Amino acid sequence: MEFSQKLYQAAKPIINDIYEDDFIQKMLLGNIQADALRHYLQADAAYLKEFTNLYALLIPKMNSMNDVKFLVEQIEFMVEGEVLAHDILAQIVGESYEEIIKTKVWPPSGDHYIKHMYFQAHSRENAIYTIAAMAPCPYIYAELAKRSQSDHKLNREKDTAKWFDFYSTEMDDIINVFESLMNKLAESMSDKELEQVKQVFLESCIHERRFFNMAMTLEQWEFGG
Amino acid sequence: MEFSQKLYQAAKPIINDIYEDDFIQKMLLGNIQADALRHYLQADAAYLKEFTNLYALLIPKMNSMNDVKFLVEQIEFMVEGEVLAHDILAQIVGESYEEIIKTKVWPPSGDHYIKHMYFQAHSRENAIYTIAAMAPCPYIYAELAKRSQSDHKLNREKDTAKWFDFYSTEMDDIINVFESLMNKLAESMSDKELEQVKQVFLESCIHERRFFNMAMTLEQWEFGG
Amino acid sequence: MEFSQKLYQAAKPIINDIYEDDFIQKMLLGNIQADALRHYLQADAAYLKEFTNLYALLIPKMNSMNDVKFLVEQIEFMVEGEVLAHDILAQIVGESYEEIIKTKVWPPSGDHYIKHMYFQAHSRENAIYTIAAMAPCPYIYAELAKRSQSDHKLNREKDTAKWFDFYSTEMDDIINVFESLMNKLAESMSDKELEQVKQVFLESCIHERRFFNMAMTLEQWEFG
Amino acid sequence: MEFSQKLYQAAKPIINDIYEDDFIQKMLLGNIQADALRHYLQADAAYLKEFTNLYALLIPKMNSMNDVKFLVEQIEFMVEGEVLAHDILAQIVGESYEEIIKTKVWPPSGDHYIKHMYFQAHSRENAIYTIAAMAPCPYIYAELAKRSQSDHKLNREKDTAKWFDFYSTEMDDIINVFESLMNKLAESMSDKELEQVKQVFLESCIHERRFFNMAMTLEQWEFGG
């Protein structure tokens, strides 16, 4: 089949394991406590400028200037603020998004996620490796949202369900762009080369699951005992 | 004086030699040949993708987000593809700009300039070294155009003068941005480091002279001995 | 004090947590399972090529040619074997070393360690970060093994105590080298920068603990 | 024919020009003077460390450990000193090597060459780009020195002949290693990629021609006018 779809098939048991894990399950039935959600926000904000830096590192890896335009736009979007799914999470805790992130966290998981992406952008000439590393989302985020709407255990009464509504639609653009690039780039690559890329993708897929478990566990570096 | 003013000071003897070299001189009188203008644009257009790359690499070196927005504009400006001074040089040869750059050339002088800038981007952590490599591009051009306005040898009947009129104004805004970045970053640096930075800036000055001269001499790699 | 001692002082709680984790405690008593030694040997041999690359990447960052002569020797060392601590460990499983490492393993824990190191080699001009990131390795192994020599729990009637005897001694030259380097580089640096270097150091300390813990827990990527 | 021979055959007209240029000719007759020799020795020493760094950066791009054992050996040889050709040259300037290189110079021609090799080392994942950039150096010297043995203008009464006698032999091992690495690595590559590798190699041949020239002309960065 097509390469990006080969990725999606391998990613199934993980999105499955992410869906049945504690973050998603708890978001689903409305019972998720504002402490876990605080950890998730502070970290996302903390790694913000890293994501910005990765798109810019993608630019010299490009060829078509149409793809460069898009990377500018994604860099543009993040600096331009306006995080909608974040204010829905800000609602559930009941404090503003900006006030929560005045404190920041750099947990061992986010650190592991960020350096996985950076290793690809520093060590690997072909863009597909960086791109495969940043792709597992919002692909994962979208697929979770769609499993939500069909699911009858979904709690629609609370403000947890407005999170799922966001990722069902608004992630779908950049998924296609990443899908185009990866599929286009894989045409000339060998089977051995492509197995690496897939591994890059699936490691990132785990990093998402670990990122949610990080939020739930209030994870940090323990240097003091 | 401010650190960047010491840089301008040092640059004067070179900026002078450039002004007195055949390119600008033959640009002043308006007698310059479509030969050299063709070579000039072709080299410059082949290096278009490379300058887009350099503004991208500077982003992860930027600690201030207003600095990042600036670098973003320069990429957008390069993606939009509006080159005013180039369309001016095109009509003098009498072909459209797209026809001329359909053929590209990649001369030694230009190779050395590019590789100099990439060396900073690639191996130097501090954004001051790359910027200092890039700065003598909009400064020198503005300075020559400003000299030509008070010069009685400037032939105002010829269309070559429109080129000068463009560079006496349109470069001013980006210079000051490079000027503020350089001056800001030099504050925390040892005097010896600044001796390196100054060296980097001065080589670029030299490459500008060499680039112009390459167009006059229709320079290229001769591998055929 | 010197900067490197400041690093050693902060590394203490972590080193203690490592000593009281399962790997060292079971290494002391002799009763450590062969599953874990197996995973430890394979994860360590899979990451060998990476450690080669990191010393190599430190060379352009050096100035002195004596520092270079050192980095060269460590790679010349790594080529050859002289894996005597590992030669000892393979006797405990009862398979030969070469037979064990025929299948390499590539655990998430190691992955995070390696990439943390590489990050320094790739993104930081000054060598001190990449050195800070690799320094916990000899220093931690040394300390734990020094501790074992004053510790009555250690079973000298099992072959596992030969591990500690090796690491009580044979790391000491490379620790001094590293110690010189960090101390000399720190002189010219601000307090803020050294706050980052210390953080890089302590993370590898943590990575060291997770490396051990991973052999114990047979850690791997579960894609299925 | 094997890939490296395609390279060797293309290098011929550039090697012939280098042979006919002033440095080698004056080396031949023995009338080359201390000025140019000193400048050659100074530039060469000044770039040692850099050529040393490059071997190191080939390591992470290496597949097997025997290629690494070689690279280590190269760095091991540069650390230990023992420059036989350089001592032959120092005798002619009538001084000691260590005295001559106490003063160092980094001329434009040298700078361009160095930045050419580093560009390959920083931006190109595949080892073949960096090796092809470094391969012309030993190879050219070998070819030059072998040609002198059949040349009756070779002045056997001056120690300049010992300079050729050395390069006629002592470069062969490393040439052969590089030849094996380039052949092996080329097998997996498209013809289009190989055209770029050939371009790097030939660019390095030209740089060799300019390095000798820079020495005869006492080249330096001219910032003063």
Swiss-Prot record, chain C:
Which InterPro entries does the entry mention?
Answer: Haem_Oase-like_multi-hlx, Thiaminase-2/PQQC, Thiaminase_II, Thiamine_Salvage_TenA
Q: Name one GO molecular function term.
A: thiaminase activity
The disulfides recorded in the entry are none
Where, in this chain's numbering, is substrate bound?
44, 141, 167
Q: Which reaction does it catalyse?
A: 4-amino-5-aminomethyl-2-methylpyrimidine + H2O = 4-amino-5-hydroxymethyl-2-methylpyrimidine + NH4(+); thiamine + H2O = 5-(2-hydroxyethyl)-4-methylthiazole + 4-amino-5-hydroxymethyl-2-methylpyrimidine + H(+)
Coiled-coil residue windows: none
Q: In which pathway does it act?
A: Cofactor biosynthesis; thiamine diphosphate biosynthesis
Q: Which Pfam families match?
A: TENA_THI-4
What are the catalytic residues? 137 (nucleophile), 208 (proton donor)
Is Cell division one of the keywords UniProt gives this record? no
Q: Name one GO cellular component term.
A: cytosol
For site (Increases nucleophilicity of active site Cys), what residue positions does UniProt give?
Answer: 47
Assembly and partners are described as: Homotetramer.
Function of the molecule: Catalyzes an amino-pyrimidine hydrolysis reaction at the C5' of the pyrimidine moiety of thiamine compounds, a reaction that is part of a thiamine salvage pathway. Thus, catalyzes the conversion of 4-amino-5-aminomethyl-2-methylpyrimidine to 4-amino-5-hydroxymethyl-2-methylpyrimidine (HMP). Is also able to catalyze the hydrolytic cleavage of thiamine; however, this thiaminase activity may not be physiologically relevant. Therefore, is probably involved in the regeneration of the thiamine pyrimidine from thiamine degraded products present in the environment, rather than in thiamine degradation.
- Protein family (similarity comment): Belongs to the TenA family.
- Protein name per Swiss-Prot or TrEMBL: Aminopyrimidine aminohydrolase
Q: Could you tell me which species this protein originates from?
A: Staphylococcus aureus (strain MRSA252)
Gene name, please?
tenA
